[PDB]
């Protein structure tokens, strides 16, 4: 008994995104399938609902013109299509199921990132200046998320703080990965940045 | 002819097995099961998906954990593809798993404290400890409350004491009258 | 829509205490539903129909309320109880969620360790300069970072990013980046980051 | 604001003391109220903060489990109750008001302080 959604999609503004939710362990037409989105670092936001048995869909007035929720009982899969995509539509879209009480079952969530930027490799800049000093690597100007950051190929895991990426005004992402080490040990320290969406691997000595 | 009665049983509030005796029908028929809850947010009855098959015919159904809402009325409907509807309180049908990790602690020479680890919340369960002696062949019963500690104050080292415990969903969280299966007896 | 307001916005309590979360609705609703979202996971129903526990929810959770005012109670807090809770309604169309109450771990107050990083030479060669201010291991979360470029307040040139509460010590770390052009970076000489926190008697400044 | 501290005095080790910070000039109902201590041989150290009613009360590691900050908003007063006092607690206690309603530690108005000797 699961709801399996499609993978994350990077879309451009003005386009449309179709998120799918395939149900297993019960009948699609025997439940009510709701669509709820959550913006990054924001609360849950209900988008719409559908009774797969009858095909009737109810939409939140915010998306009443843009979202369309459909169902296929033969394949037991529902779709939510959001058109006229905007950068405000970057969010994780969940399919929830009402079977007995409340939203019993939830999908894992599909991340839809709406941005006009194209895939760019990260630029790693060394961040260098107490008995304990701090070293870091500035991952800048990459698209899309995520960037995997390691220190000394996994040797450093104690004082490593990797900060969540902040979307720049230019549409690219920036994060900083900081390690905190004793000043006496200043041992070589290296930041390894792996950006798979651009197939980039940078080993920077800080 | 009346439809066979559905005997639903919840096991440790993990899964529910519902069964019926379809052999009573002269013509082998694959009886269908539709279940739901009264006063639920979903008005559409649920069709059974995990069917149990015996003698090449539907003998029952199995429901998973997220379908089991105790303290709410469970309505089961056996439909002939003539319907039989049963209104049930799963709180009175929960059959716990047998107590596990039975262990005797010799607090004193004459005192024996039997302790067992149950696979469900101890407060919801009342236990029944049966102890047997080589001479006392009849299994002496002492019901024990939610506190799973049975302290016999009069024991004999010569006597080969055997202990076995069966839990029940009673009475704090539900009034189930179906005792659990006996645990593996432990000897002393 | 029936707007649901959830208080407090953040609830910092140590494990073992009792947590009370309040939902108030603009209009009366028949029931309240409660959902628990862990970081990186989908929401999970706890309370349905204002009092009833969902499947698999431990007995610590309780719900009560009527009309507009509803409350979710956790008699004892546990490590797996510190999450974001959402109150939801179905009485009026459309369904509405609360903005969420983050249940936080309450440790002792730790003043932020402040470090300053100037831009590297390579970044200047590219054509941009980013100055980084790092606050390390501070609790509570609320801290203020301001940029004193040549003793002048900078507004709109900085971006702040804070990590989640650390698992080991339940503290926070914050990073504030100041982005300037190379020309603007070379116009000034002294770059300072001044930090105010509740654990600090006076603001801590780090400059280069 | 004119914060005034009172209640300081000599206390035997392991005793209990109560300190009061009265605010004259602004109402404390909207601001956090913090207690700091300064030892004669040390620098100023954060002791505790009483935030707005319902927003919690936070303490330093040293005073955790002994000190408690109470908040009488009607009288515009903030109290610090010390139990199991130690000789390390001998210091001058000052009281400050966090001008930021968002609890960013903007201490603009400080108090005169009271010497507590253990």
Residue numbers in the entry:
A (entry chain B): 2 to 130, 137 to 193, 196 to 215
B (entry chain A): 55 to 135, 140 to 246
C (entry chain C): 1 to 208
D (entry chain D): 4 to 121
The study reports:
To investigate the molecular mechanism underlying the differential effects of blocking IL-2 activity by 2D4 and REGN7257, we utilized cryo-electron microscopy (cryo-EM) to resolve the structure of 2D4 antibody in complex with the CD132 antigen. Compared to REGN7257, the spatial hindrance between 2D4 and IL-2 is significantly reduced, with no overlap between the positions of 2D4 and CD25 (lL2Ra). Considering that binding to different sites of CD132 may result in different blocking effects on the six upstream γc cytokines, we strategically designed 2D4 to minimize inhibition of Tregs, crucial for SLE protection. More importantly, high-dose REGN7257 downregulated Treg proportions in CD3+ T cells, reaching its lowest level at day 30, while 2D4 had no effect on Treg proportions and even showed an up regulatory trend in later stages of recovery.
CD132, also known as IL-2RG or common γ chain (γc) cytokine receptor, is the common subunit of γc cytokines, including interleukin-2 (IL-2), IL-4, IL-7, IL-9, IL-15, and IL-21.
